[PDB]
């Protein structure tokens, strides 16, 4: 009896420790994948509040915790492998299945052990349990690389760790084991809830990493609407390197006239057009054929090139004078931050005179095109300005 109360005290402290850790590390994940770890911290917080409360024992106290957390634990798993309509369909179906599973378990546990109502709730709960575990096994078939390995660990934890619950359910009918049921339930809750949140965190950590061999890092940013983006800058600013790093498609290089090189990348309804500004004066008039309906203007500048930083400003200001780009949102990539002589973002802002720009929605991001750092942050801002406005 005293061991059952000691585990309730350990569970309360354990759930709270996993709550703050899951919250403290949530800032490292990109905002696209932070929803999973937020739910993960919410599961431990709900378990902490209910284990603080834990005639006789209160079965309803634990089943109230299960009926809320189990669907949420499926939400943070489905938020990893699905998105959009497929995510909402699975959350509804799995949440309903978990609700019937937990509800049937409460119907049977609140009856006489070994009675027909006890086994009926066991039969219904096991059927939905097998259904949930079969759908979980079939999840993540499209994942590859580190995400597939990370999701395999999430699957294995639930597929193995949740077996303790039906075993603990049948303990009262295989022996004088009323106390070991709460022991099995409590230890399983600590292992599964704290464990899944850690595994959900490591998953979202992978989805936010710089490795992009499978080309998934920058696709969940721009959405489905039309978005014409012009990315210009001086030669050797890093524009082609950024195009490759986006992993949004093969670069299409054209030469419409001798001395004018154009690079395009198309994905969904999103397009990047790239050329070098400056150069010969006879080339500048040809840029006007590409300005119409441009929604985003990305200006790349070599932060390590201090001799040409003043010409970079002159080209940007000439571009911002074009009437066809009066509504274009400006995003400035302070590229090559990894180089030792690289000017910081505030210095590039001062050298380019961005604070003098009126009626212009702009933003500057320090970036390293070789490693990709900063590219997601700048594009997430640009995508947010163009989608929400
Ligand atoms: N160290 C460093 N080098 C970069 C970075 N971005 C581009 N480069 C280098 O700059 C050189 C030319 O860049 P490029 O993409 O061709 O610039 P573009 O002419 O505007 O397309 C390449 O050799 C890149 O390796 C960066 O962020 N850091
Ligand atoms: C955070 C709490 C967790 C993950 C609880 C999970 C509960 C289940 C997997 C247990 C379901 C049951 C059966 C499969 C059979 C007997 C009745 C239940 C409810 C114990």
């Amino acid at each position: 009896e005293e061991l059952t109360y000691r585990l309730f005290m350990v569970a309360t402290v354990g759930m709270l420790a996993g709550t703050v850790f899951l919250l403290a590390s949530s800032r490292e994940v990109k905002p696209e994948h932070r929803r999973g770890v937020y739910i993960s911290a919410l599961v431990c917080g709900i378990a902490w509040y209910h284990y603080q409360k834990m005639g006789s024992y209160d079965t309803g106290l634990r089943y109230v915790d299960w009926v809320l957390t189990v669907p949420l634990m499926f939400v943070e798993v489905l938020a990893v492998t699905r998105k959009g309509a497929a995510y909402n369909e699975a959350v509804r179906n799995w949440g309903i299945a978990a609700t019937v599973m937990i509800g049937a378990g409460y119907y049977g546990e609140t009856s006489a052990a070994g009675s027909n109502e006890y086994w009926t709730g066991f039969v219904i709960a096991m059927a939905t349990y097998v259904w949930l575990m079969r759908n979980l096994q079939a999840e993540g078939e499209g994942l590859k690389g580190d995400q597939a390995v990370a999701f395999e660990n999430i699957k294995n934890l639930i597929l193995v760790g949740w077996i303790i619950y039906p075993l603990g359910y049948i303990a009262p009918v295989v022996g004088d084991f009323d106390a070991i049921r709460e022991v099995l339930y409590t230890i399983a809750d600590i292992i599964n809830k704290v464990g899944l949140g850690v595994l959900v965190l490591q998953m979202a950590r992978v989805q936010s990493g710089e490795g992009n061999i499978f080309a998934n890092k920058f696709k969940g940013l721009f959405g489905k609407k039309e978005m014409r983006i012009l990315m210009v800058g001086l030669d050797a600013a890093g524009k082609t390197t950024i195009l490759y790093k986006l992993k949004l498609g093969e670069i299409v290089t054209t030469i419409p006239t001798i001395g004018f090189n154009v690079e395009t990348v198309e994905y969904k309804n999103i397009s990047f057009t790239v050329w070098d500004v400056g150069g010969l004066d006879k080339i500048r008039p040809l840029w006007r054929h590409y300005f119409q309906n441009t929604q985003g203007l990305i200006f790349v500048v070599d932060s390590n090139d201090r001799e040409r930083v003043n010409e970079a400003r002159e080209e940007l200001m000439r571009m911002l004078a074009e009437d066809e780009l009066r509504d274009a949102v400006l995003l400035v990539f302070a590229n090559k931050q990894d180089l030792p002589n690289a000017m910081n973002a505030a210095e590039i802002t001062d050298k380019l005179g961005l604070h003098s720009l009126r009626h212009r929605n702009w933003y500057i991001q320090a970036t390293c095109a070789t490693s990709g750092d900063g590219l997601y942050e700048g594009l997430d801002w640009l995508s947010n300005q163009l989608r929400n406005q």
Side-chain angles (χ1 to χ4, degrees), residues 5 7-8 10-26 28-34 36-51 53-55 58-60 62-82 84-88 90-133 135-143 145-169 171-175 177-190 192-209 211-223 226-267 269-279 281-306 308-350 352-387:
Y5 176 80
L7 289 180
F8 286 163
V10 173
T12 299
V13 181
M15 297 299 186
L16 182 60
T19 304
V20 59
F21 171 56
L22 269 40
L23 287 180
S25 309
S26 61
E28 297 179 342
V29 181
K30 307 294 184 179
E32 182 182 359
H33 326 101
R34 287 173 193 171
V37 66
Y38 281 165
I39 304 298
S40 294
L42 182 59
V43 177
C44 299
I46 293 177
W48 163 88
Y49 174 78
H50 289 146
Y51 272 98
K53 294 182 176 181
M54 309 181 196
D58 200 336
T59 298
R62 192 189 299 273
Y63 274 85
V64 163
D65 194 72
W66 290 358
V67 75
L68 294 176
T69 49
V70 176
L72 260 51
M73 298 173 72
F74 284 137
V75 164
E76 71 200 43
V77 171
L78 291 167
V80 158
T81 60
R82 303 193 189 191
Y87 165 84
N88 299 326
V91 163
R92 166 184 165 275
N93 293 337
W94 294 27
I96 284 176
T99 312
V100 176
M101 181 185 64
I102 303 303
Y106 183 79
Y107 169 85
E109 194 156 338
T110 50
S111 295
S115 65
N116 46 38
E117 303 122 29
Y118 172 87
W119 290 112
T120 295
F122 177 82
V123 170
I124 300 302
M126 281 292 300
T128 52
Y129 175 84
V130 171
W131 185 91
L132 284 168
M133 295 309 167
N135 289 33
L136 181 67
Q137 271 257 286
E139 195 67 22
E141 299 175 8
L143 297 175
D146 295 357
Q147 292 181 30
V149 178
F151 189 57
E152 175 174 341
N153 297 343
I154 290 175
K155 292 168 55 182
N156 291 331
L157 180 63
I158 296 174
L159 289 172
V160 176
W162 293 27
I163 297 181
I164 311 177
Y165 299 103
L167 288 180
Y169 184 91
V173 299
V174 301
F177 298 147
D178 295 322
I180 214 62
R181 169 180 52 180
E182 307 302 323
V183 170
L184 292 170
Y185 283 173
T186 299
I187 300 177
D189 281 349
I190 280 296
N192 289 314
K193 276 174 182 79
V194 179
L196 183 62
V198 168
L199 293 187
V200 166
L201 171 69
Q202 297 170 351
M203 159 62 74
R205 168 183 302 166
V206 168
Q207 298 172 332
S208 302
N212 199 26
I213 286 183
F214 300 98
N216 63 88
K217 188 180 177 184
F218 297 100
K219 286 182 174 174
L221 273 177
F222 298 97
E226 178 80 358
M227 190 174 304
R228 298 242 282 269
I229 296 183
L230 263 55
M231 182 165 73
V232 295
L234 291 184
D235 48 68
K239 300 183 300 301
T240 296
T241 304
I242 294 176
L243 284 183
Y244 276 116
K245 204 69 174 182
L246 295 191
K247 299 263 187 166
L248 298 177
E250 28 93 54
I251 300 175
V252 181
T253 293
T254 63
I255 304 94
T257 194
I258 303 302
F260 184 46
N261 185 274
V262 185
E263 290 175 308
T264 61
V265 168
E266 298 175 53
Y267 169 76
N269 287 322
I270 276 71
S271 61
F272 296 83
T273 301
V274 175
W275 66 73
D276 300 333
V277 289
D281 296 331
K282 61 175 185 178
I283 302 296
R284 300 170 175 269
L286 297 177
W287 302 344
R288 89 211 145 181
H289 300 292
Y290 301 79
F291 291 160
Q292 183 178 10
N293 305 331
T294 295
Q295 298 152 254
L297 179 60
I298 296 183
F299 194 89
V300 191
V301 55
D302 188 338
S303 308
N304 193 73
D305 195 333
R306 312 206 186 186
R308 302 174 68 197
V309 68
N310 195 82
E311 186 190 11
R313 185 187 73 244
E314 179 164 330
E315 291 298 329
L316 168 63
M317 293 310 165
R318 279 213 207 180
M319 219 69 160
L320 296 180
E322 298 287 350
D323 284 326
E324 283 169 322
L325 309 181
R326 65 183 173 279
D327 298 324
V329 180
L330 177 62
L331 175 66
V332 170
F333 278 155
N335 195 34
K336 307 197 187 178
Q337 287 289 324
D338 56 318
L339 293 179
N341 302 114
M343 297 174 283
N344 85 100
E347 190 175 9
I348 297 292
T349 305
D350 183 78
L352 297 198
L354 300 174
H355 290 129
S356 59
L357 299 180
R358 291 178 173 176
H359 312 329
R360 181 70 60 177
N361 184 21
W362 63 273
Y363 185 94
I364 183 170
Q365 244 298 318
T367 58
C368 178
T370 42
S371 71
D373 297 333
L375 290 178
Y376 188 94
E377 285 72 18
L379 292 169
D380 195 7
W381 175 90
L382 182 55
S383 181
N384 282 323
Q385 300 294 340
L386 297 175
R387 290 184 289 110

